[PDB]
């Protein structure tokens, strides 16, 4: 087996990169450890930046999104008995965000790929990368007990947070930046109409709550919980009661509840690795960095990493300008750090932290009061939320 670009992982990063490359005539093979079904079971993201939307259109997979996607022009933040709407369109200069689930985006990409006939190997076990610094790197894996070898020119590590790619860069070459938060998000997906046309982020004394959606008849809700919690200790009944407790009364009373389709706990963390490449290997998406969900940037950062990698591979293959690939990490890290700073800020002003003194509580409240009450303050939230420009 030989291909031009080997891609590890068939989550949205690998699929999006594989689609863009296939359409430009660059052959690629995607290797995925799990089954299509398993990948399709991950709920995750709900909010997309315009840059991700345009990239899906460029990859030719935007029909259903254009049809089913909900374009949002504002978001709301509730705190201390107040509800403040941030007009994203006005304050960002016409930009907006699109609500379309990650499950959907993935489904759409998996379909486009199957129809194009590009190679995809699910259940590829024991993936190992070799000769990363040579001119001929290769990937080895096993399918049906047989160990196959895949020869290629470049390898894109799009295997997420628990992937094998990042582990393949010499530890003495990497710089890891990390921060773990003392809480997670308990999410509940229900077949009910959302309580609001726009999202509502809520800072409440009992802890954070978020009212999101997937469509007009499908909702996604979250509440902040301690890392010590087990999803089995949270019945649907218990979740709805807690959620109602953390929302403004007028919002809590319009809430249509119902049984859950999905329920899980996602712990929060920030994680950056530098550089994002080694020899013929380039990391993308969660494989290289993690942001807490508060700012809705994870999938959106994978999109810009992929857009950057794709464009640099085009130059190398099409224009014989392979030296440009050395700039991969520099370009990506600039956008990554700004998104990390925003996700960190959002997380710190909206959540309840354990062991927090009186001065800090007061400062947290004042941050919200200032930023939501100043025209310049609102613009900083909005321009960051819709997403900063791609380089």
State how far the Cα of 264 lies from the Cα of 43, in Å rounded to an integer: 10
Question: Per CB under 6 A, does 164 bind ligand FAD?
Answer: yes
209 binds ligand FAD (CB under 6 A): no
State the DSSP code for 2.
B
Catalytic one among 100, 201, 317, 328? 201
Interaction mask 262-281, ligand FAD, x per CB under 6 A: ----x---------------
Residue at token pair 């009186």 = 358
Distance CA 6, CA 198 (A): 40
Q: In terms of residues, how long is the chain?
A: 391
**SS3 of residue 216 by DSSP:** coil
d(CA 276, CA 298): 16
Nearer to ligand FAD among residue 12 and residue 74 (C-beta): 12
Q: CB of residue 266 vs ligand FAD: minimum separation in angstroms?
A: 4
C-alpha to C-alpha distances, 58 to 14, 19, 37, 52, 54, nearest whole angstrom = 16, 10, 26, 10, 6
Which of 18, 51, 74, 187 lies at the binding interface for ligand FAD (CB under 6 A)?
187
Q: Which of 59, 97, 129, 296 binds ligand FAD (CB under 6 A)?
A: 296
The two tokens of residue 298 are 């994870």
Q: Is 166 in the site for ligand FAD (CB under 6 A)?
A: no
Which among 275, 297, 310, 317 is annotated as catalytic? 297
Q: Does 101 bind ligand FAD (CB under 6 A)?
A: no
Count CA within 13 A, CB hemisphere, residue 62.
Answer: 16
Q: Which residue has the tokens 């403040």?
A: 84
**Nearest distance from residue 332's CB to ligand FAD, in Å?**
13
Among 5, 6, 12, 364, binds ligand FAD (CB under 6 A): 12
CA count, 13 A, side-chain hemisphere, 173: 10
Of the residues 69, 137, 163, 275, which one makes contact with ligand FAD according to CB under 6 A:
163
**Which residues make Cβ contacts (< 8 Å) with residue 113, sequence separation at least 6?**
15, 18, 19, 22, 30, 120
Task: Using the rule CB under 6 A, give the single segment among 40-48, 167-175, 274-282, 331-339 that binds ligand FAD.
Answer: 40-48
Which of residues 286 and 340 has its CB atom nearest to ligand FAD in the complex? 286
Give the pair of three-digit tokens for residue 163.
Answer: 């992937």
3-state secondary structure of 268: strand
Q: Could you tell me if 341 and 295 are in contact, meaning their C-beta atoms sit under 8 angstroms apart?
A: no
3-state helix, strand, coil in the chain (%, to 5): 40, 30, 30
Whole-angstrom Cα distance, residue 77 to residue 150?
Answer: 50
| Nearest distance from C-beta of residue 126 to ligand FAD, angstroms | 8
Enumerate residues 57-86 that contact ligand FAD by CB under 6 A: none
Backbone angles phi, psi at 253, to 5 degrees: -80, -15
CB of 222 or CB of 371, closer to ligand FAD: 222
- Can 338 be counted among the known catalytic residues? no
**Binding segment (CB under 6 A) for ligand FAD, from list 43-51, 72-80, 203-211, 225-233:** 43-51
Cβ nearer to ligand FAD, comparing 4 with 34 = 34
- Residue 299 binds ligand FAD (CB under 6 A): yes
Binding site for ligand FAD (CB under 6 A): 8-14, 31-34, 39, 44-47, 102, 124, 127, 158-160, 162-164, 185, 187, 266, 285-287, 293, 296-300, 302
What residues are designated binding site for substrate?
201, 212-214, 222, 293
Supply the residues annotated as catalytic.
72, 201, 293, 297, 385
């Amino acid at each position: 087996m030989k291909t031009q670009v080997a891609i590890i992982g068939a989550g949205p990063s690998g699929l999006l990169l594989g689609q863009l490359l296939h359409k430009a005539g660059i052959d690629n093979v995607i290797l995925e450890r799990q089954t299509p079904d398993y990948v399709l079971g991950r709920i995750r993201a709900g909010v997309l930046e315009q840059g991700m939307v345009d990239l899906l259109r460029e990859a030719g997979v935007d029909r259903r999104m254009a049809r089913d996607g909900l374009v949002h022009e504002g978001v709301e933040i509730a705190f201390a008995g107040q509800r403040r709407r941030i007009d994203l369109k006005r304050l960002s200069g016409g930009k907006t965000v699109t609500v379309y689930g990650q499950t959907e985006v993935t489904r759409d990409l998996m379909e486009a790929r199957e129809a194009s006939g590009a190679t995809t190997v699910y259940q590829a076990a024991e993936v190992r990368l070799h000769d990363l610094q040579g001119e001929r790197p290769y990937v080895t894996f096993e399918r049906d007990g047989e160990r196959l070898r895949l020869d290629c020119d470049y390898i894109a590590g799009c295997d997420g947070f628990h992937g094998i790619s990042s582990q393949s860069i010499p530890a003495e070459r990497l710089k890891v930046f990390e921060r773990v938060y003392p809480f997670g998000w308990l999410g509940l997906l229900a077949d009910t109409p959302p309580v609001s046309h726009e999202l509502i982020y809520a800072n409440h004394p009992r802890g954070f709550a978020l009212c999101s959606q997937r469509s007009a008849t499908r909702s996604r809700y979250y509440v902040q919980v301690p890392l010590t919690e087990k999803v089995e200790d949270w019945s649907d009944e218990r979740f709805w009661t807690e959620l109602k407790a953390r929302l403004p009364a007028e919002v809590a009373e319009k809430l249509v509840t119902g049984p859950s389709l999905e329920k899980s706990i996602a712990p929060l963390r920030s994680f950056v690795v530098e550089p994002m490449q080694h020899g013929r290997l380039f990391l993308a998406g969660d494989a290289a960095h993690i942001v807490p969900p508060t700012g809705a940037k994870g999938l959106n950062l994978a999109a810009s990493d992929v857009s950057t990698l794709y464009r640099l591979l085009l130059k190398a293959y099409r224009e014989g300008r392979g030296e440009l690939l050395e700039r991969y990490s520099a370009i990506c890290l600039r956008r990554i750090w700004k998104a990390e700073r925003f996700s960190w800020w959002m997380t710190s002003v909206l959540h309840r932290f354990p062991d927090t003194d009186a001065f800090s509580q007061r400062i947290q409240q004042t941050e919200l009061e200032y930023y939501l009450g100043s025209e310049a303050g609102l613009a900083t939230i909005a321009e960051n939320y819709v997403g900063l420009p791609y380089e």
